[PDB]
Design a protein around this ligand. Sequence first.
Ligand SMILES: Nc1ncnc2c1ncn2[C@@H]1O[C@H](COP(=O)(O)O)[C@@H](OP(=O)(O)O)[C@H]1O
Ligand SMILES: Nc1ncnc2c1ncn2[C@@H]1O[C@H](COP(=O)(O)O)[C@@H](OP(=O)(O)O)[C@H]1O
Lengths: 281, 282
Amino acid sequence: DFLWFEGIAFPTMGFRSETLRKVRDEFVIRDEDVIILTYPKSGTNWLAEILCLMHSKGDAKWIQSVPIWERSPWVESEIGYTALSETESPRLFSSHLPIQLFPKSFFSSKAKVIYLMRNPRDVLVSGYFFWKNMKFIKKPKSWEEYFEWFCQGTVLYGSWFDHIHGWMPMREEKNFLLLSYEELKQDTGRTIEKICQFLGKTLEPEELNLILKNSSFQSMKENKMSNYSLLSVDYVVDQLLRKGVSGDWKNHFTVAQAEDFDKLFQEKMADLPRKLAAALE
Amino acid sequence: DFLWFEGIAFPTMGFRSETLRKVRDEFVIRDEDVIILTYPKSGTNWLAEILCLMHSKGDAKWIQSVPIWERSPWVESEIGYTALSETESPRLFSSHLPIQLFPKSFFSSKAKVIYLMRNPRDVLVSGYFFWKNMKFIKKPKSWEEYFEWFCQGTVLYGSWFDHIHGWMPMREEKNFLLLSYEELKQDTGRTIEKICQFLGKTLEPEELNLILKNSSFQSMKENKMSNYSLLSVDYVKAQLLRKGVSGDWKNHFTVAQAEDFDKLFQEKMADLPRKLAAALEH
Ligand SMILES: Nc1ncnc2c1ncn2[C@@H]1O[C@H](COP(=O)(O)O)[C@@H](OP(=O)(O)O)[C@H]1O
Ligand SMILES: Nc1ncnc2c1ncn2[C@@H]1O[C@H](COP(=O)(O)O)[C@@H](OP(=O)(O)O)[C@H]1O
Protein backbone atom coordinates (compact mmCIF):
# COMPACT_ATOMS: atom_id res chain seq x y z
CA ASP A 1 0.00 0.00 0.00
CA PHE A 2 0.92 3.72 0.00
CA LEU A 3 2.27 5.99 2.71
CA TRP A 4 -0.24 8.86 2.88
CA PHE A 5 0.58 12.38 4.05
CA GLU A 6 -1.95 15.18 3.73
CA GLY A 7 -3.82 13.04 1.18
CA ILE A 8 -0.81 12.42 -1.09
CA ALA A 9 0.70 9.01 -1.79
CA PHE A 10 4.41 8.34 -1.29
CA PRO A 11 6.49 5.16 -1.48
CA THR A 12 6.32 3.13 1.74
CA MET A 13 10.12 2.99 2.18
CA GLY A 14 12.62 5.85 2.01
CA PHE A 15 10.10 8.43 3.21
CA ARG A 16 8.71 9.35 6.62
CA SER A 17 5.70 11.47 7.54
CA GLU A 18 7.75 13.07 10.31
CA THR A 19 10.29 14.22 7.71
CA LEU A 20 7.65 15.35 5.22
CA ARG A 21 6.21 17.62 7.90
CA LYS A 22 9.69 18.99 8.54
CA VAL A 23 10.43 19.33 4.84
CA ARG A 24 7.34 21.51 4.52
CA ASP A 25 7.44 23.47 7.80
CA GLU A 26 11.13 23.56 8.78
CA PHE A 27 13.57 22.86 5.93
CA VAL A 28 15.53 26.04 5.16
CA ILE A 29 15.67 27.14 1.52
CA ARG A 30 18.62 29.33 0.51
CA ASP A 31 18.69 31.95 -2.25
CA GLU A 32 21.59 30.10 -3.93
CA ASP A 33 19.69 26.83 -4.25
CA VAL A 34 18.74 25.61 -7.74
CA ILE A 35 15.71 23.35 -7.53
CA ILE A 36 14.26 20.92 -10.05
CA LEU A 37 10.47 20.57 -9.71
CA THR A 38 8.56 17.91 -11.57
CA TYR A 39 5.57 15.62 -11.35
CA PRO A 40 7.08 12.10 -11.31
CA LYS A 41 8.21 10.72 -14.69
CA SER A 42 8.43 14.12 -16.43
CA GLY A 43 12.18 13.97 -17.09
CA THR A 44 13.62 14.84 -13.68
CA ASN A 45 16.82 12.80 -14.05
CA TRP A 46 17.38 14.06 -17.57
CA LEU A 47 17.27 17.66 -16.37
CA ALA A 48 19.46 16.95 -13.34
CA GLU A 49 22.12 15.37 -15.56
CA ILE A 50 22.06 18.42 -17.83
CA LEU A 51 22.41 20.77 -14.86
CA CYS A 52 25.35 18.74 -13.55
CA LEU A 53 26.88 18.78 -17.03
CA MET A 54 26.44 22.54 -17.20
CA HIS A 55 28.41 22.74 -13.97
CA SER A 56 31.24 20.60 -15.36
CA LYS A 57 31.15 22.55 -18.63
CA GLY A 58 30.68 19.24 -20.43
CA ASP A 59 33.33 17.07 -18.76
CA ALA A 60 31.81 13.73 -17.77
CA LYS A 61 34.28 12.51 -15.15
CA TRP A 62 32.21 13.76 -12.22
CA ILE A 63 28.82 12.46 -13.43
CA GLN A 64 30.36 9.06 -14.11
CA SER A 65 32.00 8.58 -10.71
CA VAL A 66 29.33 10.04 -8.38
CA PRO A 67 25.76 8.70 -8.58
CA ILE A 68 23.07 11.09 -9.81
CA TRP A 69 20.92 11.00 -6.64
CA GLU A 70 23.95 12.33 -4.78
CA ARG A 71 24.62 15.12 -7.28
CA SER A 72 20.97 16.16 -7.11
CA PRO A 73 19.27 14.75 -3.99
CA TRP A 74 15.54 14.11 -3.74
CA VAL A 75 14.86 16.56 -0.86
CA GLU A 76 11.72 14.97 0.61
CA SER A 77 13.30 11.49 0.69
CA GLU A 78 15.09 10.42 3.91
CA ILE A 79 18.54 10.37 2.30
CA GLY A 80 18.02 13.67 0.50
CA TYR A 81 16.63 15.56 3.48
CA THR A 82 19.46 14.34 5.69
CA ALA A 83 22.09 15.20 3.09
CA LEU A 84 20.78 18.63 2.07
CA SER A 85 20.22 19.76 5.66
CA GLU A 86 24.01 20.11 5.77
CA THR A 87 25.34 20.37 2.20
CA GLU A 88 27.17 23.60 1.34
CA SER A 89 25.87 26.27 -1.02
CA PRO A 90 25.23 26.35 -3.76
CA ARG A 91 22.90 23.36 -3.43
CA LEU A 92 21.26 21.55 -6.37
CA PHE A 93 18.33 19.27 -5.61
CA SER A 94 14.98 18.02 -6.95
CA SER A 95 11.48 17.45 -5.61
CA HIS A 96 8.14 16.02 -6.75
CA LEU A 97 6.13 17.73 -4.03
CA PRO A 98 2.94 19.56 -5.06
CA ILE A 99 2.90 23.21 -3.89
CA GLN A 100 1.13 22.60 -0.54
CA LEU A 101 3.83 20.24 0.78
CA PHE A 102 6.82 22.18 -0.47
CA PRO A 103 9.16 23.92 2.02
CA LYS A 104 7.30 27.03 3.14
CA SER A 105 10.70 28.62 3.53
CA PHE A 106 10.93 28.72 -0.28
CA PHE A 107 8.29 31.40 -0.69
CA SER A 108 10.32 34.09 1.07
CA SER A 109 13.58 33.08 -0.67
CA LYS A 110 15.15 33.96 -4.01
CA ALA A 111 16.03 30.35 -4.80
CA LYS A 112 15.71 29.52 -8.49
CA VAL A 113 13.41 26.66 -9.45
CA ILE A 114 12.98 25.03 -12.83
CA TYR A 115 9.57 23.41 -13.22
CA LEU A 116 9.62 20.76 -15.95
CA MET A 117 6.24 19.67 -17.34
CA ARG A 118 5.50 16.79 -19.69
CA ASN A 119 2.45 15.72 -21.69
CA PRO A 120 0.41 13.87 -19.04
CA ARG A 121 -0.33 11.01 -21.43
CA ASP A 122 3.40 10.33 -21.84
CA VAL A 123 3.92 10.77 -18.10
CA LEU A 124 1.19 8.19 -17.45
CA VAL A 125 2.81 5.66 -19.74
CA SER A 126 6.27 6.34 -18.30
CA GLY A 127 4.97 5.78 -14.77
CA TYR A 128 3.06 2.64 -15.75
CA PHE A 129 6.09 0.73 -17.03
CA PHE A 130 8.38 2.12 -14.32
CA TRP A 131 6.19 1.64 -11.22
CA LYS A 132 5.15 -1.82 -12.48
CA ASN A 133 7.78 -4.12 -10.93
CA MET A 134 8.67 -1.53 -8.28
CA LYS A 135 8.45 -2.33 -4.57
CA PHE A 136 7.02 -0.39 -1.62
CA ILE A 137 4.28 1.18 -3.72
CA LYS A 138 0.67 0.19 -4.37
CA LYS A 139 0.77 -1.65 -7.73
CA PRO A 140 -2.30 -1.63 -10.08
CA LYS A 141 -3.65 -4.89 -11.53
CA SER A 142 -3.62 -3.80 -15.18
CA TRP A 143 -3.00 -1.01 -17.68
CA GLU A 144 -6.73 -0.24 -17.56
CA GLU A 145 -6.66 0.17 -13.78
CA TYR A 146 -3.46 2.24 -13.78
CA PHE A 147 -5.02 4.49 -16.40
CA GLU A 148 -8.02 4.97 -14.12
CA TRP A 149 -5.84 5.68 -11.08
CA PHE A 150 -3.83 8.30 -12.97
CA CYS A 151 -6.92 10.13 -14.20
CA GLN A 152 -8.25 10.30 -10.64
CA GLY A 153 -4.99 11.23 -8.93
CA THR A 154 -4.75 8.10 -6.80
CA VAL A 155 -1.08 7.53 -7.64
CA LEU A 156 2.27 8.60 -6.21
CA TYR A 157 2.28 12.35 -5.61
CA GLY A 158 -1.38 12.69 -6.47
CA SER A 159 -3.12 14.33 -9.40
CA TRP A 160 -0.98 15.62 -12.29
CA PHE A 161 -3.67 18.26 -12.80
CA ASP A 162 -3.49 19.49 -9.20
CA HIS A 163 0.28 19.38 -9.25
CA ILE A 164 0.29 21.51 -12.43
CA HIS A 165 -2.35 23.91 -11.09
CA GLY A 166 -0.77 24.48 -7.71
CA TRP A 167 2.56 25.50 -9.22
CA MET A 168 1.60 27.51 -12.33
CA PRO A 169 0.77 30.61 -10.27
CA MET A 170 4.53 30.92 -9.50
CA ARG A 171 5.29 31.01 -13.25
CA GLU A 172 5.67 34.78 -13.68
CA GLU A 173 8.08 35.08 -10.75
CA LYS A 174 11.70 36.03 -11.52
CA ASN A 175 13.04 32.89 -9.85
CA PHE A 176 10.80 30.41 -11.66
CA LEU A 177 11.60 28.82 -15.04
CA LEU A 178 9.02 26.70 -16.86
CA LEU A 179 10.26 24.05 -19.29
CA SER A 180 8.54 21.19 -21.11
CA TYR A 181 9.98 17.76 -21.77
CA GLU A 182 8.78 18.30 -25.33
CA GLU A 183 10.84 21.42 -26.05
CA LEU A 184 13.85 19.82 -24.36
CA LYS A 185 13.55 16.87 -26.78
CA GLN A 186 12.77 19.04 -29.84
CA ASP A 187 15.42 21.71 -29.37
CA THR A 188 17.84 20.67 -26.67
CA GLY A 189 20.45 23.26 -27.59
CA ARG A 190 17.91 26.06 -27.49
CA THR A 191 16.40 24.84 -24.23
CA ILE A 192 19.86 24.65 -22.61
CA GLU A 193 20.38 28.30 -23.61
CA LYS A 194 17.18 29.29 -21.81
CA ILE A 195 18.53 27.48 -18.75
CA CYS A 196 21.97 29.15 -19.04
CA GLN A 197 20.17 32.48 -19.40
CA PHE A 198 18.06 31.66 -16.32
CA LEU A 199 20.94 30.57 -14.08
CA GLY A 200 23.34 33.17 -15.46
CA LYS A 201 25.74 30.77 -17.12
CA THR A 202 27.64 30.93 -20.40
CA LEU A 203 29.00 28.06 -22.49
CA GLU A 204 31.61 27.72 -25.24
CA PRO A 205 30.47 25.77 -28.33
CA GLU A 206 32.66 22.79 -27.42
CA GLU A 207 31.12 22.73 -23.93
CA LEU A 208 27.54 22.73 -25.22
CA ASN A 209 28.42 19.88 -27.59
CA LEU A 210 29.83 17.77 -24.75
CA ILE A 211 26.66 18.45 -22.78
CA LEU A 212 24.33 17.53 -25.64
CA LYS A 213 26.37 14.40 -26.23
CA ASN A 214 26.70 13.36 -22.59
CA SER A 215 23.04 14.02 -21.72
CA SER A 216 21.73 12.08 -24.70
CA PHE A 217 19.38 9.19 -24.00
CA GLN A 218 21.94 6.53 -24.93
CA SER A 219 24.83 8.23 -23.14
CA MET A 220 22.85 8.40 -19.90
CA LYS A 221 21.50 4.88 -20.29
CA GLU A 222 25.10 3.62 -20.43
CA ASN A 223 26.17 5.61 -17.35
CA LYS A 224 25.87 3.44 -14.23
CA MET A 225 26.03 6.56 -12.05
CA SER A 226 23.10 8.29 -13.76
CA ASN A 227 20.90 5.35 -14.73
CA TYR A 228 20.76 4.74 -10.97
CA SER A 229 17.61 5.14 -8.81
CA LEU A 230 17.49 4.56 -5.05
CA LEU A 231 13.91 3.30 -5.21
CA SER A 232 13.66 -0.42 -4.38
CA VAL A 233 12.74 -2.44 -7.47
CA ASP A 234 11.76 -6.11 -7.24
CA TYR A 235 15.01 -7.37 -8.75
CA VAL A 236 13.50 -10.86 -8.79
CA VAL A 237 11.03 -9.53 -11.38
CA ASP A 238 13.04 -6.94 -13.34
CA GLN A 239 14.59 0.48 -16.24
CA LEU A 240 14.86 4.21 -15.41
CA LEU A 241 15.60 5.12 -19.04
CA ARG A 242 12.94 3.33 -21.10
CA LYS A 243 12.54 4.90 -24.58
CA GLY A 244 13.25 8.55 -23.94
CA VAL A 245 11.03 9.85 -26.71
CA SER A 246 7.85 11.88 -26.87
CA GLY A 247 4.41 10.64 -27.89
CA ASP A 248 4.82 6.99 -26.91
CA TRP A 249 1.35 7.28 -25.41
CA LYS A 250 -0.18 6.73 -28.85
CA ASN A 251 1.18 3.17 -28.78
CA HIS A 252 -0.70 2.39 -25.56
CA PHE A 253 -3.83 4.55 -25.37
CA THR A 254 -6.82 2.95 -27.03
CA VAL A 255 -8.87 5.43 -29.05
CA ALA A 256 -11.45 5.16 -26.28
CA GLN A 257 -8.96 5.96 -23.50
CA ALA A 258 -7.63 8.85 -25.62
CA GLU A 259 -11.08 10.40 -26.12
CA ASP A 260 -11.86 10.07 -22.42
CA PHE A 261 -8.58 11.68 -21.47
CA ASP A 262 -8.96 14.58 -23.90
CA LYS A 263 -12.31 15.15 -22.25
CA LEU A 264 -10.92 15.01 -18.71
CA PHE A 265 -7.99 17.22 -19.72
CA GLN A 266 -10.15 19.75 -21.57
CA GLU A 267 -12.16 20.08 -18.38
CA LYS A 268 -9.44 20.41 -15.72
CA MET A 269 -7.24 22.70 -17.84
CA ALA A 270 -10.06 25.14 -18.59
CA ASP A 271 -8.71 27.94 -16.37
CA LEU A 272 -5.13 27.77 -17.69
CA PRO A 273 -3.55 29.48 -20.77
CA ARG A 274 -3.95 27.63 -24.07
CA LYS A 275 -0.33 28.40 -24.94
CA LEU A 276 0.44 26.24 -21.90
CA ALA A 277 -1.30 23.16 -23.34
CA ALA A 278 0.32 23.77 -26.74
CA ALA A 279 3.83 23.30 -25.32
CA LEU A 280 2.93 19.72 -24.40
CA GLU A 281 2.59 18.34 -27.95
CA ASP B 1 34.94 20.87 12.03
CA PHE B 2 33.76 17.66 13.73
CA LEU B 3 30.56 16.99 15.65
CA TRP B 4 31.84 16.33 19.17
CA PHE B 5 29.89 13.89 21.33
CA GLU B 6 31.28 12.52 24.58
CA GLY B 7 34.85 13.39 23.61
CA ILE B 8 34.70 11.55 20.27
CA ALA B 9 34.63 13.09 16.80
CA PHE B 10 31.84 12.29 14.32
CA PRO B 11 30.91 13.60 10.86
CA THR B 12 29.03 16.91 10.67
CA MET B 13 26.17 15.53 8.58
CA GLY B 14 24.26 12.30 9.08
CA PHE B 15 24.67 12.20 12.85
CA ARG B 16 22.84 13.89 15.72
CA SER B 17 23.91 14.04 19.36
CA GLU B 18 20.29 13.27 20.26
CA THR B 19 20.54 10.01 18.33
CA LEU B 20 24.00 9.10 19.61
CA ARG B 21 22.62 9.52 23.11
CA LYS B 22 19.66 7.25 22.28
CA VAL B 23 21.98 4.70 20.70
CA ARG B 24 23.58 4.34 24.13
CA ASP B 25 20.65 4.25 26.55
CA GLU B 26 17.66 3.45 24.38
CA PHE B 27 18.37 1.44 21.22
CA VAL B 28 17.31 -2.17 21.75
CA ILE B 29 19.76 -4.90 20.70
CA ARG B 30 18.08 -8.17 19.81
CA ASP B 31 19.51 -11.59 20.50
CA GLU B 32 19.20 -12.41 16.78
CA ASP B 33 21.28 -9.39 15.70
CA VAL B 34 24.65 -9.86 13.97
CA ILE B 35 26.85 -6.82 14.41
CA ILE B 36 30.05 -5.66 12.72
CA LEU B 37 32.38 -3.59 14.89
CA THR B 38 35.38 -1.77 13.51
CA TYR B 39 37.49 1.28 13.94
CA PRO B 40 36.87 3.12 10.63
CA LYS B 41 38.92 1.95 7.62
CA SER B 42 39.68 -1.52 8.97
CA GLY B 43 37.56 -3.35 6.38
CA THR B 44 33.95 -2.81 7.51
CA ASN B 45 32.42 -3.01 4.02
CA TRP B 46 34.49 -6.00 3.04
CA LEU B 47 33.15 -7.91 6.03
CA ALA B 48 29.61 -6.69 5.42
CA GLU B 49 29.75 -7.89 1.81
CA ILE B 50 30.95 -11.26 3.06
CA LEU B 51 28.14 -11.51 5.63
CA CYS B 52 25.62 -10.53 2.97
CA LEU B 53 26.93 -13.12 0.53
CA MET B 54 26.89 -15.71 3.32
CA HIS B 55 23.20 -14.97 3.71
CA SER B 56 22.64 -15.09 -0.06
CA LYS B 57 24.57 -18.38 -0.28
CA GLY B 58 26.99 -16.81 -2.74
CA ASP B 59 24.27 -15.52 -5.05
CA ALA B 60 25.11 -12.00 -6.24
CA LYS B 61 21.66 -10.75 -7.30
CA TRP B 62 20.68 -9.12 -3.99
CA ILE B 63 24.02 -7.46 -3.18
CA GLN B 64 24.09 -6.08 -6.72
CA SER B 65 20.55 -4.73 -6.50
CA VAL B 66 20.47 -3.13 -3.05
CA PRO B 67 23.09 -0.64 -1.81
CA ILE B 68 25.41 -2.00 0.89
CA TRP B 69 24.54 0.73 3.44
CA GLU B 70 20.99 -0.64 3.23
CA ARG B 71 21.97 -4.29 3.62
CA SER B 72 24.19 -3.41 6.58
CA PRO B 73 23.14 -0.05 8.04
CA TRP B 74 25.44 2.12 10.17
CA VAL B 75 23.59 2.02 13.53
CA GLU B 76 24.77 5.36 14.92
CA SER B 77 23.88 7.31 11.75
CA GLU B 78 20.50 9.06 11.44
CA ILE B 79 19.56 6.85 8.51
CA GLY B 80 20.78 3.64 10.10
CA TYR B 81 19.16 4.26 13.46
CA THR B 82 15.67 4.87 12.10
CA ALA B 83 15.98 2.02 9.59
CA LEU B 84 17.10 -0.61 12.12
CA SER B 85 14.36 0.33 14.58
CA GLU B 86 11.88 -0.83 11.91
CA THR B 87 13.77 -3.79 10.42
CA GLU B 88 12.66 -7.36 11.11
CA SER B 89 15.01 -9.88 12.66
CA PRO B 90 17.45 -11.16 11.87
CA ARG B 91 19.13 -7.76 11.61
CA LEU B 92 22.62 -7.19 10.21
CA PHE B 93 24.39 -3.91 10.86
CA SER B 94 27.67 -2.21 11.72
CA SER B 95 29.15 0.34 14.07
CA HIS B 96 32.48 2.10 14.63
CA LEU B 97 31.54 3.20 18.13
CA PRO B 98 34.12 2.69 20.87
CA ILE B 99 32.67 0.45 23.62
CA GLN B 100 31.70 3.28 26.03
CA LEU B 101 29.23 4.69 23.47
CA PHE B 102 27.84 1.34 22.23
CA PRO B 103 24.20 0.45 23.06
CA LYS B 104 24.18 -0.71 26.68
CA SER B 105 21.33 -3.12 25.93
CA PHE B 106 23.94 -5.12 24.04
CA PHE B 107 25.96 -6.24 27.06
CA SER B 108 23.09 -8.24 28.55
CA SER B 109 22.05 -9.70 25.18
CA LYS B 110 23.08 -12.76 23.15
CA ALA B 111 23.59 -10.85 19.87
CA LYS B 112 26.76 -11.94 18.07
CA VAL B 113 29.36 -9.32 17.20
CA ILE B 114 32.43 -9.62 14.99
CA TYR B 115 35.22 -7.18 15.84
CA LEU B 116 37.56 -6.61 12.92
CA MET B 117 40.95 -5.04 13.69
CA ARG B 118 43.58 -3.94 11.17
CA ASN B 119 47.16 -2.73 11.44
CA PRO B 120 46.81 0.90 12.60
CA ARG B 121 49.40 1.99 10.05
CA ASP B 122 47.29 0.67 7.19
CA VAL B 123 44.19 2.12 8.85
CA LEU B 124 45.88 5.52 8.97
CA VAL B 125 46.88 5.50 5.28
CA SER B 126 43.49 4.15 4.23
CA GLY B 127 41.77 6.91 6.18
CA TYR B 128 44.06 9.69 4.97
CA PHE B 129 43.22 9.01 1.32
CA PHE B 130 39.54 8.43 1.98
CA TRP B 131 38.74 11.39 4.28
CA LYS B 132 41.20 13.64 2.45
CA ASN B 133 38.56 15.16 0.17
CA MET B 134 35.46 14.22 2.20
CA LYS B 135 33.04 16.90 3.33
CA PHE B 136 31.37 17.29 6.74
CA ILE B 137 34.60 16.47 8.60
CA LYS B 138 37.70 18.43 9.60
CA LYS B 139 40.29 18.27 6.81
CA PRO B 140 43.99 17.94 7.77
CA LYS B 141 46.42 20.48 6.32
CA SER B 142 48.73 17.72 5.08
CA TRP B 143 50.00 14.16 5.40
CA GLU B 144 52.22 15.20 8.31
CA GLU B 145 49.23 16.69 10.08
CA TYR B 146 46.94 13.72 9.47
CA PHE B 147 49.68 11.46 10.80
CA GLU B 148 49.82 13.65 13.90
CA TRP B 149 46.06 13.77 14.31
CA PHE B 150 45.81 9.98 14.04
CA CYS B 151 48.54 9.43 16.61
CA GLN B 152 46.87 11.77 19.07
CA GLY B 153 43.45 10.29 18.43
CA THR B 154 42.08 13.63 17.30
CA VAL B 155 40.36 12.04 14.31
CA LEU B 156 36.99 10.48 13.51
CA TYR B 157 35.98 8.07 16.26
CA GLY B 158 38.92 8.91 18.51
CA SER B 159 42.14 7.06 19.23
CA TRP B 160 42.59 3.68 17.58
CA PHE B 161 44.43 2.60 20.74
CA ASP B 162 41.53 3.46 23.06
CA HIS B 163 39.09 1.86 20.64
CA ILE B 164 41.05 -1.41 20.76
CA HIS B 165 41.52 -1.36 24.54
CA GLY B 166 37.84 -0.74 25.23
CA TRP B 167 36.70 -3.71 23.16
CA MET B 168 39.39 -6.31 23.88
CA PRO B 169 37.80 -7.17 27.25
CA MET B 170 35.03 -8.85 25.21
CA ARG B 171 37.59 -11.03 23.43
CA GLU B 172 36.72 -14.12 25.44
CA GLU B 173 32.93 -13.74 25.61
CA LYS B 174 31.11 -16.38 23.52
CA ASN B 175 29.03 -13.98 21.42
CA PHE B 176 32.16 -12.10 20.37
CA LEU B 177 34.39 -12.96 17.41
CA LEU B 178 37.71 -11.18 16.87
CA LEU B 179 39.20 -11.12 13.36
CA SER B 180 42.07 -9.28 11.74
CA TYR B 181 42.08 -7.70 8.28
CA GLU B 182 45.44 -9.35 7.70
CA GLU B 183 44.13 -12.89 8.32
CA LEU B 184 41.11 -12.22 6.14
CA LYS B 185 43.60 -11.23 3.43
CA GLN B 186 46.10 -14.03 4.10
CA ASP B 187 43.42 -16.75 3.88
CA THR B 188 39.88 -15.55 3.22
CA GLY B 189 38.55 -19.08 2.89
CA ARG B 190 39.75 -19.98 6.38
CA THR B 191 38.42 -16.78 7.96
CA ILE B 192 35.01 -17.31 6.38
CA GLU B 193 35.10 -20.83 7.75
CA LYS B 194 35.69 -19.30 11.21
CA ILE B 195 32.82 -16.88 10.75
CA CYS B 196 30.50 -19.74 9.73
CA GLN B 197 31.48 -21.66 12.83
CA PHE B 198 30.78 -18.56 14.96
CA LEU B 199 27.36 -17.80 13.45
CA GLY B 200 26.50 -21.45 13.13
CA LYS B 201 26.14 -21.49 9.35
CA THR B 202 27.02 -24.26 6.90
CA LEU B 203 27.81 -23.80 3.21
CA GLU B 204 27.99 -26.02 0.15
CA PRO B 205 31.34 -25.98 -1.73
CA GLU B 206 29.90 -24.07 -4.69
CA GLU B 207 28.35 -21.51 -2.32
CA LEU B 208 31.70 -20.89 -0.64
CA ASN B 209 33.36 -20.42 -4.03
CA LEU B 210 30.83 -17.75 -4.94
CA ILE B 211 31.20 -16.04 -1.58
CA LEU B 212 34.98 -15.89 -1.97
CA LYS B 213 34.75 -14.79 -5.60
CA ASN B 214 32.14 -12.07 -5.06
CA SER B 215 33.80 -10.78 -1.88
CA SER B 216 37.20 -10.46 -3.58
CA PHE B 217 38.58 -6.94 -4.13
CA GLN B 218 38.41 -6.98 -7.93
CA SER B 219 34.82 -8.21 -8.03
CA MET B 220 33.68 -5.92 -5.24
CA LYS B 221 35.32 -2.89 -6.89
CA GLU B 222 32.96 -3.35 -9.86
CA ASN B 223 29.65 -3.42 -7.97
CA LYS B 224 28.48 0.18 -7.61
CA MET B 225 26.09 -1.04 -4.91
CA SER B 226 29.05 -1.85 -2.67
CA ASN B 227 31.91 0.32 -3.93
CA TYR B 228 30.30 3.35 -2.35
CA SER B 229 29.20 4.99 0.91
CA LEU B 230 26.70 7.66 2.01
CA LEU B 231 29.42 10.23 2.71
CA SER B 232 29.31 13.22 0.35
CA VAL B 233 32.75 13.91 -1.12
CA ASP B 234 33.88 17.26 -2.55
CA TYR B 235 34.85 15.44 -5.77
CA VAL B 236 38.46 15.79 -6.93
CA LYS B 237 40.48 10.14 -6.22
CA ALA B 238 38.90 8.83 -2.97
CA GLN B 239 37.19 5.52 -3.79
CA LEU B 240 36.02 3.11 -1.07
CA LEU B 241 38.07 0.24 -2.47
CA ARG B 242 41.44 1.97 -2.97
CA LYS B 243 44.06 -0.81 -3.08
CA GLY B 244 42.80 -3.49 -0.70
CA VAL B 245 46.11 -4.93 0.52
CA SER B 246 48.13 -5.02 3.73
CA GLY B 247 51.32 -3.05 4.27
CA ASP B 248 50.55 -0.18 1.94
CA TRP B 249 51.76 1.95 4.86
CA LYS B 250 55.42 1.37 3.94
CA ASN B 251 54.69 3.39 0.79
CA HIS B 252 53.74 6.51 2.74
CA PHE B 253 55.35 6.45 6.19
CA THR B 254 58.75 8.16 6.19
CA VAL B 255 61.40 6.17 8.05
CA ALA B 256 61.22 8.78 10.80
CA GLN B 257 57.45 8.49 11.10
CA ALA B 258 57.83 4.71 11.23
CA GLU B 259 60.25 4.91 14.15
CA ASP B 260 58.03 7.43 15.91
CA PHE B 261 55.00 5.21 15.36
CA ASP B 262 56.70 2.02 16.50
CA LYS B 263 57.59 3.77 19.75
CA LEU B 264 54.03 4.99 20.33
CA PHE B 265 52.53 1.61 19.45
CA GLN B 266 54.90 -0.26 21.74
CA GLU B 267 54.01 1.90 24.77
CA LYS B 268 50.24 1.98 24.18
CA MET B 269 49.99 -1.74 23.43
CA ALA B 270 52.30 -3.01 26.18
CA ASP B 271 49.40 -4.05 28.44
CA LEU B 272 47.82 -6.29 25.79
CA PRO B 273 48.72 -9.82 24.59
CA ARG B 274 51.60 -9.99 22.14
CA LYS B 275 49.40 -12.42 20.20
CA LEU B 276 47.14 -9.53 19.18
CA ALA B 277 50.10 -7.40 18.13
CA ALA B 278 51.36 -10.22 15.90
CA ALA B 279 48.01 -10.77 14.18
CA LEU B 280 48.28 -7.19 12.88
CA GLU B 281 51.48 -7.96 10.99
CA HIS B 282 51.87 -8.70 7.27
N1 LIG C 1 18.56 11.70 -21.78
C1 LIG C 1 17.24 11.50 -21.85
N2 LIG C 1 16.58 11.85 -22.99
C2 LIG C 1 15.24 11.66 -23.09
N3 LIG C 1 14.42 11.13 -22.16
C3 LIG C 1 15.10 10.79 -21.03
C4 LIG C 1 16.48 10.93 -20.79
N4 LIG C 1 16.81 10.47 -19.52
C5 LIG C 1 15.66 10.06 -19.03
N5 LIG C 1 14.60 10.22 -19.89
C6 LIG C 1 13.21 9.87 -19.70
O1 LIG C 1 12.62 10.59 -18.64
C7 LIG C 1 11.57 9.76 -18.04
C8 LIG C 1 11.86 9.61 -16.55
O2 LIG C 1 11.45 10.80 -15.88
P1 LIG C 1 11.87 11.12 -14.37
O3 LIG C 1 13.32 11.43 -14.36
O4 LIG C 1 11.07 12.27 -13.90
O5 LIG C 1 11.57 9.92 -13.54
C9 LIG C 1 11.59 8.44 -18.82
O6 LIG C 1 10.61 8.50 -19.87
P2 LIG C 1 10.02 7.24 -20.67
O7 LIG C 1 9.52 6.27 -19.68
O8 LIG C 1 8.93 7.74 -21.52
O9 LIG C 1 11.09 6.65 -21.48
C10 LIG C 1 13.03 8.41 -19.30
O10 LIG C 1 13.35 7.53 -20.36
N1 LIG D 1 37.05 -7.00 -0.93
C1 LIG D 1 38.01 -6.32 -0.29
N2 LIG D 1 39.22 -6.91 -0.12
C2 LIG D 1 40.22 -6.25 0.51
N3 LIG D 1 40.19 -5.01 1.02
C3 LIG D 1 38.96 -4.43 0.84
C4 LIG D 1 37.84 -5.00 0.21
N4 LIG D 1 36.78 -4.12 0.22
C5 LIG D 1 37.26 -3.06 0.83
N5 LIG D 1 38.56 -3.18 1.23
C6 LIG D 1 39.42 -2.21 1.92
O1 LIG D 1 38.94 -1.88 3.20
C7 LIG D 1 39.31 -0.50 3.51
C8 LIG D 1 38.03 0.29 3.84
O2 LIG D 1 37.57 -0.08 5.15
P1 LIG D 1 36.16 0.38 5.72
O3 LIG D 1 35.10 -0.39 5.03
O4 LIG D 1 36.14 0.10 7.17
O5 LIG D 1 36.02 1.82 5.45
C9 LIG D 1 40.06 0.00 2.28
O6 LIG D 1 41.46 -0.18 2.50
P2 LIG D 1 42.59 0.59 1.68
O7 LIG D 1 42.24 2.02 1.67
O8 LIG D 1 43.87 0.34 2.34
O9 LIG D 1 42.58 0.05 0.31
C10 LIG D 1 39.47 -0.88 1.19
O10 LIG D 1 40.18 -0.99 -0.02
